[PDB]
Design a protein around this ligand. Sequence first.
Ligand SMILES: Nc1ncnc2c1ncn2[C@@H]1O[C@H](CSCC[C@H](N)C(=O)O)[C@@H](O)[C@H]1O
Lengths: 265, 265
Amino acid sequence: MVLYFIGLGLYDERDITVKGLEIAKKCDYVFAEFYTSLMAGTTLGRIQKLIGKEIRVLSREDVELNFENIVLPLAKENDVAFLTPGDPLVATTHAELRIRAKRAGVESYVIHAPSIYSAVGITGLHIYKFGKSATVAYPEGNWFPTSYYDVIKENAERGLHTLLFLDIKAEKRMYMTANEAMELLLRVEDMKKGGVFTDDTLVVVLARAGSLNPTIRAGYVKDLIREDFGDPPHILIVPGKLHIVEAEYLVEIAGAPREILRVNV
Amino acid sequence: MVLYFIGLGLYDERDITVKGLEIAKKCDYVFAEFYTSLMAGTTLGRIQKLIGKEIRVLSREDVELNFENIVLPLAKENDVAFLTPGDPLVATTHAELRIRAKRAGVESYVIHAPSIYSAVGITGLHIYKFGKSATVAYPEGNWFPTSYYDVIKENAERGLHTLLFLDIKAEKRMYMTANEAMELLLRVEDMKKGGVFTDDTLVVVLARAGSLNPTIRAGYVKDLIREDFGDPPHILIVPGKLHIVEAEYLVEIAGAPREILRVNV
Ligand SMILES: Nc1ncnc2c1ncn2[C@@H]1O[C@H](CSCC[C@H](N)C(=O)O)[C@@H](O)[C@H]1O
């Protein structure tokens, strides 16, 4: 008699909230997708073990095309759950699935979970200072995406930071790295030459948020473009004008160039 | 030798992640702060009983002035947990505390949890479209702060949504309602006449996020300004131009008027 959208969190199976676990343990059927993001700290088995239910995984197509044929039909006579990495409604199009649920006469509920969108708080950058966000997508064929480049520009002009979700092709097991994302951004700089992303632009990389030992680094592109930030997933951030306290955290915690301390007011 | 920054999540004692609960249980000492925000759906006692540990509450002064004298000493020789509502380090002042830990030769780890900053995804508004964030503060005495008005203006100007955290007098335990916030914004409009917030402005109200039954309502100020959204906490959102999918969700799930489909898209 219900459908639950339950978030699994940032890194491993324990990133689920107690609410989400207690509820998932009591559902009759459990579905999940693992294409919107990457949980590099667990495995399907451990999750199934933690929840104590068989977890039927779905592909982007099963979801996007047959959600109402695969999941909804059961939600009518049973308690069904749909799991996702991080928060189920952040940087996905899952929200519209609630509309399908409604249109099918199924009540739906949402259980949140830690999201990279808020997790960036660990970088020491003020969350309220983040502007519009964007995704650095893989180029395909002769199509060259540049929108994400303009987002950075627009925010930087207001002194705001930019959060850059990195692309992903789960079926191919391809998880864009920050290094890759930086390369792509430099290329776009050649094209537009708007002085947005150069070798002297300060950036911050967060890898494996949620793990006890995430990788947090801040520095100039020229020096990080070649750095190894560990296994994915990675997120890239282009800070705006920094508050002194932010710079302090970047230098003290993310080992950034001690020079960023002398901010330009 | 270890300090754990553990987030308590959105609303009640079950909004902590399994990771945060287990880690908290294995800690020798447990501290908590409830001045950046509160956990409206639970009590200190319900949290203590869930953690199975005595929890010492610290004031703003305790943390901001004597964190190194109250919390860190015990960390140098034990496993200490510092709990906070939401997701740690989303609150501006938190990050600075990791530096203090370092200064004392103490290791600190962060255990994330759902933040309202990311939970707003349940409103159907695309997360990437959220711009700079602001807080609607209660005017007091000869001080009438209004920057939050300019934040809406700059965001909406760029087609971006604006998340407004509503003021909370933690000690006094008073919550600013969305209605109160709307009234304030209508007054700030009469003073700046910038056409940023009026009776015809479309807004979204999210109450008790995290709860299984939050209140998600969308509509024009003139219709919502005196509507009862239930118990706190309330979050107010002034969306920018809407993508049709966002609008369809607001109408179908948040009871928004069909009118927004042609006026705000
Ligand atoms: N633990 C983590 N560390 C760093 N980046 C992460 C991450 N989890 C997700 N991301 C980033 O976000 C992208 C997925 S976008 C979907 C986000 C998800 N709903 C959430 O709430 O987090 C990834 O490609 C990656 O760039």
